[PDB]
């Protein structure tokens, strides 16, 4: 009981976030009673939380050695192995825990989680059900299951699930315990802005607790530019400098920064994945530092202090790979959220969120913990101009007698191929070449229908858009610009040559009952037309098909394609007429993708940052007519775009031109505007004020 009292205290000191004192106490417990299984296992869990994973494992095994049937040690060891990427060891432990005790609900939930992460959603669902059946009051398992069901669009008892998620969160915040809804997901559920902000705040608070063991004073922050030769030192922190959407958005930014006034440091939180994305940020940033090499957060945060960073930019928020502990230690006087996280951090350690007036209006500043810092057009950016310049221009083949989106050719050398052809008609819009149905035209369409990889016409290489990974796998990922002429057609994706194609290329989780109802309403109003979605994942397809049958729609109306390599995804958006944006959470990166194809996107901005991004893109692009203030307006815009064929031609033309004329895809301009705002943020601080809203 001397030992027990130390252990029980340590357990409470841990629930409190007092991690150092918990450790001392478990050690003191083991000093007093060495053969104490539960204190080994508890010490192991807190060593795991601190990142000391080998030490943790050692205590888990001691605990198991003392009590061979201690299922909870196996279950928590499982988690430690999973955090070390030893998926096999994790599974060997979880399953051993469930063999020892099949009624052990925590083990079931942990197994479910590793099922979900591995891509086995039906098994994750089954195992969370088992957990909830063994322990019906189990917030983590319930909310994590609610996410799996979201992912595959299972909306069985949707309305009660939703209010159940809200009361769990209310109840968790009452008791100031960590909410089981993850902050990144909180935009999907009908919670108050207060709750979303508090969810975030509580997750930021974990980071504050992990760093207190280090006992670091506040750092001393440079108050003028004088020892950095008059340059604002800016530090971009990301797990995503590699093959990740973040790099697909901002890889050109670092190297566009003005080196007379700015000095750029990229802090990678991930190791080098071998991709051009990584190579480019490493080459073009003034300094590149691999923090994944320096796991200790105090030592890593030191580097950032000694580099001299003025502004430290958090590109992760609450996403995978985050090390927000870095920002909790405040190695810099200005710390801003940018681009990668579509929400508020909720934490005191972040000063601004870089956003914009259309995304985060003045009125809803209470949504965020941070002060608003406006970019002048949209905060969103895309590297599409650099990545996919072969999509700047297109040509078509005229199959009968003229469509912009049926049979499409793109290529760096397309002009020259065209000029090699006997008859080619130009159609004003600036212009779209049309290849009439010659022998040449027929050879192409045959390669497609035959599933052939490529053919040669007049010395030019003509590639099947379905086969890019076989021709050049770096061009499929967007790492290289394709060096051939590529053909893309509705035929390849089983789309009708003779009807309207509405699209949405997002992960299926962004869809909800209301949203699919609106889509159904639109398709019923526009006979012939189809809705073009992705298998993202594939096991969500029958749920979507069934809920749409129930709403009115015959089956043939919704066509699913596989997820494609990056360049094919962006290229194929050309085959659509219109994109219907998800209002619950908009296409963000996916919105830029569709617009770069020239495809107009209809959207209904909501309240959340996540539900207003597409509206900011369209504003910047200058297509206010595509933004709806309610559901009836969205369906009328979309039905109008599928029936008024001349207005469709006009709207398309505007998107097609304005993707070049507008600022949307103008990385140099974006960068220069980002620079102004960074300097605004710096002035307002050197004149010793503290963060305030910038507009």
């Amino acid at each position: 009981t001397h030992a027990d009292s130390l252990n029980n205290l340590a357990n409470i000191k841990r629930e409190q976030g007092n991690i150092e004192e918990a450790v001392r106490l478990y050690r003191k417990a083991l000093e007093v009673f060495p053969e104490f299984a539960a204190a080994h296992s508890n010490l192991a869990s807190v060593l795991q939380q601190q990142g000391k994973l080998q030490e943790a494992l050692m205590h888990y095994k001691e605990a198991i050695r003392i009590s061979p049937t201690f299922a909870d040690a196996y279950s928590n060891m499982g988690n430690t192995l999973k955090e070390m990427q030893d998926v096999q060891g994790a599974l060997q432990c979880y399953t051993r825990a469930i063999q020892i005790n099949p009624a052990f609900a925590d083990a079931h939930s942990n197994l479910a989680s590793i099922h979900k992460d591995s891509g086995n959603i039906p098994e994750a669902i089954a195992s969370y059900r088992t957990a909830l059946k063994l322990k019906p009051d189990f917030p983590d398992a319930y909310c994590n299951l609610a996410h799996c069901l979201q992912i595959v669009c299972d909306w069985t008892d949707y309305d009660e699930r939703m209010k159940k998620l809200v009361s769990i969160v209310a109840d968790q915040l009452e008791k100031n315990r960590l909410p089981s809804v993850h902050p990144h997901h909180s935009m999907l559920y009908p919670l108050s802005h207060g709750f979303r902000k508090a969810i975030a705040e509580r997750h930021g608070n974990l980071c504050l607790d992990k760093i207190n063991v280090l006992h670091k004073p506040p750092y001393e922050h440079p108050k003028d530019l004088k020892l950095s030769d008059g340059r604002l030192r800016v530090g971009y922190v990301s797990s995503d400098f590699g093959k990740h959407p973040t790099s697909h958005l901002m890889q050109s930014i670092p190297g566009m920064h003005n080196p007379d006034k700015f000095e750029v440091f990229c802090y990678a939180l991930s190791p080098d994945d071998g991709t051009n994305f990584r190579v480019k940020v490493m080459a073009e940033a003034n300094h590149f530092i691999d923090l994944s090499q320096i796991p200790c957060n105090g030592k890593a945060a030191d580097r950032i202090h000694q580099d001299g960073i003025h502004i430290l930019v958090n590109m992760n928020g609450y996403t995978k790979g985050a090390r927000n502990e870095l920002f909790a230690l405040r190695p810099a006087p200005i710390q801003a959220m940018w681009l990668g996280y579509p929400g508020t951090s909720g934490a005191l350690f972040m000063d601004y969120i870089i956003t914009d007036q259309e995304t985060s209006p003045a009125e809803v500043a209470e949504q965020y913990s941070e002060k608003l810092a406006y970019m002048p057009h949209t905060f969103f950016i895309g590297d599409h101009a650099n990545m996919f310049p072969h999509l700047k221009k297109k040509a078509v083949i005229d199959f009968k007698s003229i469509y912009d989106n049926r049979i499409v050719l793109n290529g760096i050398d397309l002009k020259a191929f065209l000029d090699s052809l006997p008859d080619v008609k130009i159609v004003k819009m600036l212009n779209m070449p049309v290849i009439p149905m010659n022998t040449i035209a027929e050879a192409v369409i045959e390669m497609i229908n035959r599933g052939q990889i490529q053919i040669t016409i007049n010395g030019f290489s003509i590639s099947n858009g379905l086969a890019t990974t076989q021709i050049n796998n770096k061009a499929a990922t967007g790492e290289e610009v394709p060096r051939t002429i590529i053909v893309t057609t509705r035929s390849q994706y089983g789309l009708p040559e003779d009807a309207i194609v509405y699209c949405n290329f997002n992960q299926l989780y962004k869809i909800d009952p209301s949203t699919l109802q609106m889509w159904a309403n639109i398709l019923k109003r526009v006979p012939n037309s189809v809705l073009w979605l992705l298998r993202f994942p594939a096991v969500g397809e029958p749920n979507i098909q069934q809920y749409a049958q129930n709403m009115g729609l015959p089956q043939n109306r919704i066509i699913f394609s596989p997820v494609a390599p990056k360049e094919e995804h962006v290229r194929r958006g050309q085959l659509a007429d219109v994109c219907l944006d998800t209002p619950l959470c908009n296409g963000h990166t996916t919105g830029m993708d569709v617009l770069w194809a020239g495809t107009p996107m209809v959207t209904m901005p909501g309240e959340t940052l996540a539900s207003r991004v597409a509206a900011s893109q369209l504003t910047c692009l200058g297509c206010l007519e595509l933004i709806a203030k309610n559901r009836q307006e969205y369906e009328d815009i979309a039905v109008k775009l599928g029936t008024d064929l001349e207005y469709l031609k006009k709207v398309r033309g505007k998107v097609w031109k304005q993707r070049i004329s507008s600022p949307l895809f103008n990385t140099k301009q974006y960068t220069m505007e980002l620079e102004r705002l960074y300097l605004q943020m710096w002035e307002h601080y050197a004149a010793g004020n503290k963060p305030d809203h910038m507009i």
Binding site: P183, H184, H185, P245, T319, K566
Partner: peptide, 5 residues
């Protein structure tokens, strides 16, 4: 290759 919690 996606943004994830």
């Amino acid at each position: 290759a996606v943004s994830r919690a």
